[PDB]
């Protein structure tokens, strides 16, 4: 009846083609702002002094980049963790020089993806669903917050956040390895277990379901037309898939309950990505990967190398050349 209640009913409506909700009332402005500023900056931002040493890095397409090398360059190291909106700049050109677009895009994007997770819960509540899809989405959200927010906070500068580009991401990863030895960190190893196993189990699940499809089509048409949207019955024989997979390994290694199988399919890469998000978030505070350098000595005391020592030689080569003009003192304290 009231205007506010009519607005509340429109906002929370399940009949909206794209669900808005109250989390969407924050999601849509922040994500549209971040999208518009990212597109404009990726095409036409001027070079950005990321290291705060008056050495501006061309990040945009109009300044000589391609798609692979293009990036929205992180804000200046001179700024650090300081809040740098447009109204704190004396001009828009100064804001562009110091990397203000990165701060704007990253802050609105982080709010938007947290509101995406809230909106996923919201729509699951309005649809009468169980609510934990947002918990699975909290693993990419945690990883994004680790590389765009938590690593800058721990390192003390938004210039340390992952750049918004392909080659910028590669640069972030290589400097990360040289400084934190992320490959030797077990949380990253758990993340690699998560993504390799998630892809493995995606291939397994998909291959077993495709293998055990019930014959409902001819050999001419696509087999996907054997499934009708909203059909009551099962489109594949789970018992046949279980018989195959419990003969492929052994009987008790195969799921027969589809709900336990799908909980495992959800839980494995989510827990792996949670662990790798926490690994990056803890190397924000410089709790680094394992240091086994010169761990093996002979009886005289001479160092016998291992593969970790060769890995350290690679890490040193990455470190001495990174931000080549930014260091004035002997130690890269942060």
């Amino acid at each position: 009846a009231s205007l506010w209640e009519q607005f509340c009913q429109w906002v929370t409506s399940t009949n909206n083609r794209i669900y808005v909700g109250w989390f969407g009332t924050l999601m849509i402005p922040t994500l549209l702002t971040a999208t518009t500023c990212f597109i404009i900056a990726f095409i036409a931002a001027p070079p950005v002094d990321i290291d705060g040493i008056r050495e501006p890095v061309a990040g945009s397409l109009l300044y000589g980049n391609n798609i692979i090398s293009g990036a929205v360059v992180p804000s200046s190291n001179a700024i650090g963790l300081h809040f740098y909106p447009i109204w704190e700049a004396a001009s828009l050109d100064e804001w562009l020089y110091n990397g203000g677009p990165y701060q704007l895009v990253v802050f609105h994007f982080l709010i938007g993806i947290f509101c995406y997770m809230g909106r996923q819960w919201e729509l699951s509540y309005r649809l009468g669903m169980r609510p934990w899809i947002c918990v699975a989405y909290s693993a990419p959200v945690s990883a994004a917050t680790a590389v765009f927010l938590i690593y800058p906070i721990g390192q003390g500068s938004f210039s340390e956040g992952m750049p918004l580009g392909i080659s910028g991401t590669f640069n972030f990863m290589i400097v990360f390895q040289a400084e934190h030895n992320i490959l030797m960190h077990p949380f990253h190893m758990l993340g690699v277990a998560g993504v390799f196993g998630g892809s493995l189990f995606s291939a397994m699940h998909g291959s077993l379901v495709t293998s055990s499809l019930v014959r409902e089509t001819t050999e001419v048409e696509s087999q996907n037309y054997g499934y009708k949207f909203g059909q009551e019955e099962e489109t594949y024989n789970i018992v046949a898939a279980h018989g195959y997979f419990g003969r492929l390994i052994f009987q008790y290694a195969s799921f027969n309950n589809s709900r336990s199988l799908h909980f495992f399919l959800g839980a494995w890469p989510v827990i792996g990505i949670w662990f790798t998000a926490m690994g990056v978030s803890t190397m924000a505070f410089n709790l680094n990967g394992f240091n086994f350098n010169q761990s093996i000595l002979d009886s005289q005391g001479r160092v016998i190398g291992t593969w970790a020592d060769v890995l350290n030689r690679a890490n040193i080569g990455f470190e001495v050349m990174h931000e080549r003009n930014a260091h004035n003192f002997p130690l890269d304290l942060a």
Binding site: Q251, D298, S299, Q300, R302, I304
Partner: protein, 78 residues
């Protein structure tokens, strides 16, 4: 459900099984222990002991460079 074999939970909860294994599993453990502690593993696999990584006449890495006569090469490397 059962393919024919005795179920494992029946097997490992038996007196006769643990009478056999209380002996077999620790004595395999001590067999591996005496493989290492008598030093036979070094001679079997050619792994240097902690004082034969470098000799008094070779202090560099003994990187094999021969393609066929590697036995004499390892010998003069010691």
């Amino acid at each position: 459900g059962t393919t024919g074999e005795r179920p494992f939970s029946d097997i490992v909860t038996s007196i006769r099984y643990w009478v056999i294994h209380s002996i077999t599993i620790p004595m395999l453990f001590i067999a591996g222990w005496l493989f290492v502690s008598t030093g036979l593993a070094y001679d079997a696999f050619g792994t240097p002991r902690p004082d034969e990584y470098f000799t008094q006449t070779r202090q560099e890495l003994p990187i094999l460079q021969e393609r066929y006569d590697i036995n004499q090469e390892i010998q003069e490397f010691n």
